[PDB]
Amino acid sequence: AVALVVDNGSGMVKSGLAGDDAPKCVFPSIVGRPKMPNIMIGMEQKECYVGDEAQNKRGILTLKYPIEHGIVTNWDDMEKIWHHTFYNELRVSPEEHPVLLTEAPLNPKTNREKMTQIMFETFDVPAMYVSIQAILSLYASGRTTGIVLDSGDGVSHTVPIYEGYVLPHAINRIDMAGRDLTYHMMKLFTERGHTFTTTAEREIVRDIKEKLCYIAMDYDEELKRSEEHSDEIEEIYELPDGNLITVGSERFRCPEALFNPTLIGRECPGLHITAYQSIMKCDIDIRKELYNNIVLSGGTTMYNNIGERLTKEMTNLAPSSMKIKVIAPPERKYSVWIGGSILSSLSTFQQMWITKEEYEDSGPSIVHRKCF
Amino acid sequence: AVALVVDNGSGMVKSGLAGDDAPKCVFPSIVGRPKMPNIMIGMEQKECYVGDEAQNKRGILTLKYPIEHGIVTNWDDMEKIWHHTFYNELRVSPEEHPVLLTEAPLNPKTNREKMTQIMFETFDVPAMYVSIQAILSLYASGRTTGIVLDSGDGVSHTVPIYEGYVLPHAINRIDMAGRDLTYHMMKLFTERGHTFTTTAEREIVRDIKEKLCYIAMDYDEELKRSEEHSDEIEEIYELPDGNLITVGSERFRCPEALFNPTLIGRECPGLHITAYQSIMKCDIDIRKELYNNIVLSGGTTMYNNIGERLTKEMTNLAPSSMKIKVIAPPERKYSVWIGGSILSSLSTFQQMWITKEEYEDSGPSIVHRKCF
Amino acid sequence: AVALVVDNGSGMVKSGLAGDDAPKCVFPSIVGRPKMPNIMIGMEQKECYVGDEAQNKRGILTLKYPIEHGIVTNWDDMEKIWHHTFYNELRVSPEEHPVLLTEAPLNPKTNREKMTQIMFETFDVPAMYVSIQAILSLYASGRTTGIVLDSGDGVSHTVPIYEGYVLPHAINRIDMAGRDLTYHMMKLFTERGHTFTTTAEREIVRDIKEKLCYIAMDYDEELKRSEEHSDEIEEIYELPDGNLITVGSERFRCPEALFNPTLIGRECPGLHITAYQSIMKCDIDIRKELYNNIVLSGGTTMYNNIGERLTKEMTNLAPSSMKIKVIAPPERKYSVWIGGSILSSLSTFQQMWITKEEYEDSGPSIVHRKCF
Ligand SMILES: C/C1=C\[C@H](C)C[C@H](C)OC(=O)C[C@H](c2ccc(O)cc2)NC(=O)[C@@H](Cc2c(Br)[nH]c3ccccc23)N(C)C(=O)[C@H](C)NC(=O)[C@@H](C)C1
Ligand SMILES: C/C1=C\[C@H](C)C[C@H](C)OC(=O)C[C@H](c2ccc(O)cc2)NC(=O)[C@@H](Cc2c(Br)[nH]c3ccccc23)N(C)C(=O)[C@H](C)NC(=O)[C@@H](C)C1
Ligand SMILES: C/C1=C\[C@H](C)C[C@H](C)OC(=O)C[C@H](c2ccc(O)cc2)NC(=O)[C@@H](Cc2c(Br)[nH]c3ccccc23)N(C)C(=O)[C@H](C)NC(=O)[C@@H](C)C1
Ligand SMILES: Nc1ncnc2c1ncn2[C@@H]1O[C@H](COP(=O)(O)OP(=O)(O)O)[C@@H](O)[C@H]1O
Ligand SMILES: Nc1ncnc2c1ncn2[C@@H]1O[C@H](COP(=O)(O)OP(=O)(O)O)[C@@H](O)[C@H]1O
Ligand SMILES: Nc1ncnc2c1ncn2[C@@H]1O[C@H](COP(=O)(O)OP(=O)(O)O)[C@@H](O)[C@H]1O
Ligand SMILES: [Mg+2]
Ligand SMILES: [Mg+2]
Ligand SMILES: [Mg+2]
């Protein structure tokens, strides 16, 4: 019985079969509902559109995200999304395959309890398991020592691991990700005379950010250069309705909020500062090994010149006798899914499943004593 | 029980049976009354002539139009016209067939209430229904996405529809149609020495307009050409009394008021401007689909070189990366009736009729909550 | 040298001298142009009418608004309006008095740059300054802590201020104001059989809205009452040509779009929702102080039963242990001008002017680093 790997993010949902090295079904996590009267009798209509079929007809729909900051807010929408994933994307009966789920660290217990209850009572899966995302990201890299910096759409967290042992007192988690960058980009576009307010406009701005953004090495010099010669960074983007929008300095002022959250109005520290403070809460012996195995993960770390900028920032904070190597592997967008698929194929893991009888005898609270 | 399709316009009335692709009874909507003393005893005379029998003996009659700008002004004349349609044209008892009626958008509620009350108390039809004309025009084309530009004799309106959902905030309606063009033609004929004042003269001018009018591609160049060489556009028309009238430039200066209502003294915008402003009030995503499904309807859109002129005007207003296709199907004069006949034959529509018992229990106000 | 206070709105222009508590020249912001041939030789005519002299002879004029949503669209018309204000309304040379201007938040930089360039090159004022409207509205109330909800003719925005410090990350701005309400009223009047299309008809509808509108406490019950007994809310309004129009339910269905923008077809949230979301983006400590200092401003907040309705809506959203007090002072129509006049008389402000030499040495870009 091949297991199912389902990574439920805040902006995207990945799903596939264990043993493969690439997810088979990746689609946005949105629920669309119509806001207009239906007049044309004779054509069938649906109450709610889930996934890509809500991203194409979004002009007449209102879109909802059922997950905010890695926490499920609406459970009916999440049930609809899981049903769509199981029966419309993979088309495999969930009553014959074990399911491996992922979750961010430092989350409420009720989230895990409700997830287990839904997975066991509605779909009636044989076995299930919940694991942390940073552990799977480290699994996907084929290492055992390093500090993992994961950053997705709702939450970014750093976790150190040394030779198979995790240090829970040095785990950090902040709520600042690509959605805040999208909002910052929307705010910056106002200064040029362009206004985006609706959800579809937000998706357009998100696509613009994903296409035309990069990280600058020296922020002050780039701002100075954006005055004497701004023509070198100008780009033209074609709106879906045929209009053309000019993107200039906003190509590098949007991601800068990752290293300076004061721009968006947040008091939380930056990314390099967070990594350094997470390293400094570990024992003095393992700091040298942690400094040389920095691993990047998530979709928000896909900008250009991210590894070099992070290395330069870390160098100014670390002792002069220390070597810093920021590992930024390709295809890190799906690193968590690859790590989960690798973990689910190990022969040793077959005795760590939460079976149906154990849940029935113990209840939804069993997920705390078994899963970490 | 086959339903009756009755399209009540401002200048013409179409009527027929559901399932056919061509109206069976098309006749003008006029009520004629004599204005001369009757002397010849022995021959029968009637107080009022309705339909074609008032168009032939119009020399001794005064003609009244009971509908102005899609609004019924005199209800007794409309009752007479409906009686003539039911008992003299189709010769089918209205007490056994459901009736499907049409109406222009953005009309007063009292019109619909009075129409329902008359159809239910006088004729005592089993079931009835009222629908918008643009929806039926889109039904007749076999599509689901597009912007419909309907233009008849009293009112011209544009309505966008996207995948079965109508956008009521983007519906436009102006009162400028073939009757205003007839008045403009009458005014233009004065400059050549010809005067038309009576109603029969108005009908003659209307026939001249329907026969010898076309739309020019370039107005200024055509006006310039109408001086150096006017003989190429000269036509001779035989008046009913045998006289000959010469029609020259007025062949293309009459319809030009559709794209420039300032000629007739109106401040309303043109047709292409109205279509563009109706497209621009929709969401940015569906504008591309609306731009490629422009549908023409009504009898006023039957001029020559109308589609090419509309396409050229729309091209200068749309973004350069957009494709515009003006759909101008033949037999679009009766497109609304064809769409209504198609709609009335669907098996799904059989549960959307306003039955007699519902009207009796609720009153004439039921037509608002059920019909759109 | 007494300064000049000039508040440039989207529908009205206020102007006066610093130190007074009431604007001296208030007039609409419209530019009128004739659309008819001039035949009577011997009487002088003007190419364009600005201000009240275009509101009286509007029957033969086409009227243009040079400001849309707080953004100047046509600069020639704005120059004409400023010239009329300086030389025809106040009759004071602008070459001897400093000028204080106002602007809505979150506006393009080019607007401010062009405004400064025009004020410094054409009129050649000694000093100038640009400030936000909500700050002046809070100045006029004699407070330092509160959330200001300004709503005029083109844009409505909310800004929180705590003890002299503004929170730019909690400032909201939406484009929904009295002009949209006028359009909604025009659409509602169609259902009774009345049609307004021209600009003068729009002004008539605006006057009707300003005279006979109020806000209902319970919308559903009012709609139910408007059926059993509609005679209690009927009013008669005399049209300028002597006709009488009956205004019934539309007295309270027009302003309802402020608390439900879905009626007019907009996806933006209501006013109470916007205020609540602007309060919830501030720090937890200052929310209690913000909840008790809600200040209303603008001309669109002049309806009846607005404060009570806003208080009732806010109560259902705030925690049960919080006290909400909506401050709705009289003469809030000119609150921004009063606040600007108070600010311009302070002895401390005399060192915050943009002098001519600084602009000459730095350019039109100086307005960004000095003015907020
Ligand atoms: C950007 C887009 C199309 C664009 C029209 C494509 C073209 C290419 O850009 C322009 O034409 C820039 C132009 C503009 C540019 C410079 C200027 O000194 C004034 C206006 N901007 C405008 O007219 C503003 C007016 C405006 C409203 Br109301 N409140 C606002 C708040 C802040 C700023 C401006 C505004 N405007 C129409 C919009 O934002 C509209 C709603 N935006 C869209 O529909 C998105 C989905 C696509
Ligand atoms: C056009 C018709 C017949 C026509 C006689 C057929 C022939 C073929 O056309 C002419 O002979 C053109 C001729 C004419 C031509 C050139 C000219 O420098 C002067 C007159 N026009 C006239 O005599 C005018 C005189 C007129 C009266 Br009074 N007020 C008017 C207001 C404006 C203009 C002119 C007038 N006239 C007799 C008419 O309009 C009559 C009432 N029209 C008809 O019965 C219609 C139903 C059919
Ligand atoms: C409201 C005004 C005067 C009024 C005549 C004053 C009087 C007091 O009201 C009436 O008589 C109501 C009456 C009417 C009432 C009930 C009814 O079942 C049918 C008509 N309405 C009409 O005749 C419509 C006809 C109409 C044209 Br075309 N398209 C329209 C689109 C929608 C609705 C109706 C129409 N009509 C003449 C107008 O709108 C004119 C253009 N409106 C004006 O000039 C304004 C500036 C002042
Ligand atoms: N090439 C790219 N450049 C910059 N940002 C990107 C790129 N690709 C994706 N993103 C951002 O990453 C986010 C997706 O992250 P993802 O890892 O899918 O989150 P989750 O963990 O919730 O699945 C998107 O919001 C997008 O803004
Ligand atoms: N071949 C044609 N060329 C130009 N105009 C025409 C032609 N046929 C009809 N018309 C105009 O169209 C009008 C009829 O439109 P119609 O669709 O019957 O209006 P309604 O919607 O009221 O029935 C007439 O007034 C006539 O002037
Ligand atoms: N007494 C009133 N009742 C309701 N609405 C009003 C009243 N007075 C003015 N208004 C509305 O307020 C608008 C004027 O707002 P104003 O503050 O002058 O805008 P601006 O900020 O552009 O100057 C007008 O469009 C009008 O519709
Ligand atoms: Mg993730
Ligand atoms: Mg028609
Ligand atoms: Mg204002």
Residue numbers in the entry:
A (entry chain C), B (entry chain A), C (entry chain B): 5 to 376
Excerpt from the paper describing this PDB structure:
Actin II is one of the most divergent actins among eukaryotes. The structure and function of actin II are not as well understood, but mutational analyses have revealed two essential functions in male gametogenesis and in the oocyst.
JAS stabilizes both actin I and II as well as canonical actin filaments. The binding site of JAS is the same as for phalloidin; between three protomers. The average resolution of the actin II filaments with and without JAS are similar, 3.3 and 3.5 Å, respectively, according to Fourier correlation, using the 0.143 criterion. Density for ADP and Mg2+ was clearly identified in both maps. The helical twist angle for filamentous actin II was -167° and was not affected by JAS. Furthermore, JAS does not affect the overall architecture of the actin II filaments or the conformations of the D-loop and the C terminus. Notably, the distance between R62 and D289 in JAS-stabilized F-actin II is shorter than in F-actin II without JAS.
